[PDB]
């Protein structure tokens, strides 16, 4: 069995929104078994400020910048959504 090939096939907690669009990743990275994985290019993400992430909870608070993952960076596309953690 190839553990290395499957190292990043684990699920990840996403952020919801009150906007009726898909769930999106916070940023473009996630851990699997404590190891770093990168979301695929084009994956939907939220780019939050350092101030915003301190108060990111399971309820919305302020507007969140939507983006897409590009080589591990969540690049903003101009759209704003009211995002929050799924439970």
């Amino acid at each position: 069995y190839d553990y290395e090939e499957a190292r990043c096939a684990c699920p990840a907690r996403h952020l919801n929104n009150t906007n009726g669009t898909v769930l999106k990743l916070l940023g473009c990275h996630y851990f699997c078994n404590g190891t770093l994985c990168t979301a695929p290019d084009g994956y939907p993400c939220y780019n939050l400020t350092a101030q915003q992430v301190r108060t990111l909870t399971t309820y919305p608070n302020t507007s969140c910048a939507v983006g897409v993952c590009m080589k591990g960076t969540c690049v903003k596309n101009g759209t704003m959504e009211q995002c929050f953690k799924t439970p």
Binding site: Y1, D2, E5, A6, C8, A9, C10, P11, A12, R13, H14, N16, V22, L23, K24, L25, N33, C37, A39, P40, Y43, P44, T86, P87
Partner: protein, 65 residues
């Protein structure tokens, strides 16, 4: 109704049946992509593509277990 995790990297290669404990289907159109999540006996979750034959067969096997 809203999935608490979503899959964005799907395991292409077969997971041995002896390692599998259970599965759940992520079918919500609210995740960016649909997936099957297998839970292993070590309690790890592994994302897989519901369109692979081995995924469908592993689901049938676990249904019989």
């Amino acid at each position: 109704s809203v999935p608490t995790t979503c899959c964005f990297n799907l395991a292409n290669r077969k997971i041995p049946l002896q390692r599998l404990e259970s599965y759940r289907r992520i079918t919500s159109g609210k995740c960016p992509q649909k997936a099957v999540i297998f839970k292993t006996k070590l309690a790890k979750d592994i994302c897989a593509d519901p369109k692979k034959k081995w995924v469908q067969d592993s689901m049938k096997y676990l249904d019989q277990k």
